[PDB]
Predict the structure of cholinesterase.
Amino acid sequence: IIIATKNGKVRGMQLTVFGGTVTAFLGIPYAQPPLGRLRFKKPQSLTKWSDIWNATKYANSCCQNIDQSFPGFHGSEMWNPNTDLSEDCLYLNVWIPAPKPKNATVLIWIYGGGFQTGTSSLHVYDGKFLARVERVIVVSMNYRVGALGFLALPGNPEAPGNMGLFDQQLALQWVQKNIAAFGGNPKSVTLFGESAGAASVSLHLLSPGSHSLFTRAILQSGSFNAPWAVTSLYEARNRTLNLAKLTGCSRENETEIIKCLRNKDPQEILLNEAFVVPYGTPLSVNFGPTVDGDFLTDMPDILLELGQFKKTQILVGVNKDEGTAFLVYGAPGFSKDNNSIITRKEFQEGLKIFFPGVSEFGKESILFHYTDWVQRPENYREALGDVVGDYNFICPALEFTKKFSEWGNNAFFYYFEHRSSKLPWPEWMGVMHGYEIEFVFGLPLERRDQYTKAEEILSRSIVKRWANFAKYGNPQETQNQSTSWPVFKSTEQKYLTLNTESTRIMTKLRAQQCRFWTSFFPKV
Ligand SMILES: *[C@@H]1O[C@H](CO[C@H]2O[C@@H](C)[C@@H](O)[C@@H](O)[C@@H]2O)[C@@H](O[C@@H]2O[C@H](CO)[C@@H](O)[C@H](O)[C@H]2NC(C)=O)[C@H](O)[C@H]1NC(C)=O
Ligand SMILES: *[C@@H]1O[C@H](CO[C@H]2O[C@@H](C)[C@@H](O)[C@@H](O)[C@@H]2O)[C@@H](O[C@@H]2O[C@H](CO)[C@@H](O)[C@H](O)[C@H]2NC(C)=O)[C@H](O)[C@H]1NC(C)=O
Ligand SMILES: Nc1c2c(nc3ccccc13)CCCC2
Ligand SMILES: *[C@@H]1O[C@H](CO)[C@@H](O)[C@H](O)[C@H]1NC(C)=O
Ligand SMILES: *[C@@H]1O[C@H](CO)[C@@H](O)[C@H](O)[C@H]1NC(C)=O
Ligand SMILES: *[C@@H]1O[C@H](CO)[C@@H](O)[C@H](O)[C@H]1NC(C)=O
Ligand SMILES: *[C@@H]1O[C@H](CO)[C@@H](O)[C@H](O)[C@H]1NC(C)=O
Ligand SMILES: O=CN1CCC[C@H]1C(=O)O
Ligand SMILES: [Cl-]
Ligand SMILES: [Cl-]
């Protein structure tokens, strides 16, 4: 199977899926490899080739540091890159139903990883099931991460910032220009992503350059208003200069700094990324999105508040235990290998780990709000997880959804509370950050892979709801006497719970906690 694109022919491969066939094109280039003089610059447009490009295997993942905290452990290692690392990493993947569809809706995945890690080739992002079951087309792309993708010297096109976001945008443009050739509808494209990928999705809603490039958006566990998601101009400058110093590239002509950094091997840059800040936390994002005056024209909180974004439908949600994953990467008393019953004192030391630059009054106020118990030994353990999850993910997602819906668009919010039966992390960590993803991509539909019957059922319905949102803008499951998903409005704030047992309509998720984080805490 061979498809003619604008820049040349590509050959794909046939896959067998559920007694049917899916056609996969893995590793199509969408930009000039950003090497040599091109490192740190916006992605440059592609050449044009005369032969047939073999797209029959995942391409290189972008350069990045790897998680080495738990060698041999599937829980952490499943997120590590499964393909060679290289600066030559600007490639995308396409899954298509067989027989070739005529005008199929397109789903474009953007992975998360704190803007420092990630790759589109992970097992949990395999689009072949969505293509097989719902007959949509699935696209995913690799984008630059870390300093290589987000190094900023505002105004300087040698390193203007936001390069990884421009990588994403160029791929959306590739779909606009080429997807009809694959049987897709360029007028029916839904972006979806998780964590930093969801933050990216929300930023595409704000970038005027992305507005004509997609129809609707889905945000899983992330939004730009999260405290880790956008780096200030002040922080970005101090970090760029710190990087230059650590690598011996401190100069006076800022452009000369960039030249010096271009002569360093990727490993020396990667090695020094962790130290551009005096203290980090498990949620540190040293090189992330900035206000560059190009992709992002002003502080995004201002744009959101004043209604300056694409007017369309959104689907947003979070998991029950967003915060727990991070506790075992530094908080004292914690371990994936015991029940982590911590003391008041340990909770206090824990806040210092996650809020290192915050005043003593600020840390006390967190403790006051989360430690009025009604006693129970796991009180402090659970409080710290909730602190981390509410501050970093849930409260920002809820505030994003309210502000967005106030300008008249339909929004739908979910609360995912099912813990995978195959979860390799201990049960005290609950419904973890990142563990709805395999349900969305329909992994439990494969009966050969250890999931329960109830989980097959949950994933099937989730897959249908996501597909109906992309196609029709309304995430219902209309056939099997399902609970109707009500629109989220700023007054009533209805949301839908996703679980194996009882799907329910609820109101005002974490009302009391979020009043603390959203209204008060930004003042300390
Ligand atoms: C902006 O940058 C300076 C640079 O600090 C150094 O820190 C190293 C970890 C590394 O990045 C190196 O390249 C860089 O020169 C920060 O100054 C530091 O601030 C801390 C806390 O105030 C002091 O304890 C240190 O003495 C000082 N570092 C040294 C050794 O000079 C500064 O904090 C930072 N500003 C911020 C955080 O916005
Ligand atoms: C749960 O485990 C943590 C982590 O302890 C680590 O180190 C060894 C004790 C090893 O056997 C293994 O259990 C684990 O990887 C214990 O918390 C504390 O961890 C800090 C880390 O800085 C150490 O300073 C403490 O010494 C350690 N406590 C102890 C008992 O020494 C924690 O106590 C344990 N909690 C339980 C048993 O519920
Ligand atoms: N590295 C991780 C990522 C995610 N969840 C994780 C959970 C536990 C440990 C590492 C993780 C979800 C977003 C992508 C990366
Ligand atoms: C592409 O793959 C096919 C596999 O049959 C092969 O015939 C062709 O030569 C390949 N082109 C390359 C590797 O350049
Ligand atoms: C698909 O739908 C669009 C409207 O979005 C229509 O204009 C277009 O012609 C269709 N393409 C095909 C080939 O069906
Ligand atoms: C810095 O050096 C570059 C490259 O030689 C040059 O183009 C530019 O004019 C210089 N800028 C300043 C501020 O001196
Ligand atoms: C609807 O229910 C049937 C069984 O009655 C099941 O086979 C099918 O997968 C369900 N459809 C969805 C979208 O959940
Ligand atoms: O994985 C690492 N991090 C750090 C900040 C956000 C988070 C993520 O899952 O995208
Ligand atoms: Cl709960
Ligand atoms: Cl139901």
